[PDB]
Design a protein around this nucleic acid. Structure first.
Length: 155
RNA sequence: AAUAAAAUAUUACUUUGGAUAGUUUAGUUUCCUGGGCGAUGAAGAACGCAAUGAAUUGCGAUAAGUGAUAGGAACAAUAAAAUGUGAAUAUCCAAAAUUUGAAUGCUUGAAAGUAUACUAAGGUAUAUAUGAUAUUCAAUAUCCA
């Protein structure tokens, strides 16, 4: 699976990617939307607070039946949740990209999460035995995640 | 009156999907030659056999192969051994061909078995109907001493 975009300067960027990750797309799509654009150090702090339910992930698009929370004030979204599994998966990719940046020799304190995209992946099927002799589909929703860190500079 | 979070629209890239294009060791039809099975056990079924095999292919206790005749230097995923004193490969040939199956000594269900005779174990023959010949008989059935 290729990357959605290429960095402007390959010498000052780092990349990490995960394919067919066993994590819900709709949860990880909203989590990756929250950390887009902030600094790597800030993003790691934000993702860690989400795990222990101290900062919200606003479910802006997929908000059907999602309950309201007190931390969703100011985000123009009345709904949010604390996806632990999806936050953990991104935390492992953010760490992996950072080690790639360090090998390149970049300055970790200057890196930001410039590009982060989530794509749908192939589903896996399972049986759900319903009434009157029926069987349904019990399908997973995996996803691919791509992460690109670039240094922030004045323009 | 204001927001663009959601929503909507266009393009580029990526993704799920497998359309489209290119292609064919596969099919369909017609035509030519034959139309060559079996008690000398067929077609079919079952089991087994490779140095590493489950299927498939080939084969039958001589097992992915034996002899003979052609054939001329390979096979390979990995080792071995053999090999111009003959490796692969080919066959209307020779030997060999497990349990069954018309199945045919008797039985057979998913049944393991078992009788007699001939030459302990092994191997042969013994089902039903039927033609010819040989031999042994039955019936005063017709004569007949």
């Amino acid at each position: 699976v290729k990357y959605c975009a290429k960095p402007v300067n390959v010498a000052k960027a780092a990349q990490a990617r995960g394919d067919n990750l066993k994590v819900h797309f709709k949860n990880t799509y909203e989590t990756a939307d929250a950390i887009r654009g902030m600094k790597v150090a800030r993003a790691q702090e934000f993702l860690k607070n989400v795990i222990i339910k101290k900062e919200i992930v606003p479910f802006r698009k997929h908000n059907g039946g999602v309950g309201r929370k007190a931390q969703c004030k100011g985000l123009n979204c009345a709904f949010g949740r604390w996806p632990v599994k999806s936050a953990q998966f991104i935390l492992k990719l953010l760490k992996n990209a950072v080690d790639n940046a360090k090998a390149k020799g970049l300055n970790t304190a200057l890196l930001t999460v410039s590009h982060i995209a989530v794509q749908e992946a192939r589903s896996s099927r399972r049986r759900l035995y319903r009434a009157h002799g029926s069987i349904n589909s019990f399908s997973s929703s995996p996803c691919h995640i791509e992460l690109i860190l670039t240094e922030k500079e004045k323009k």
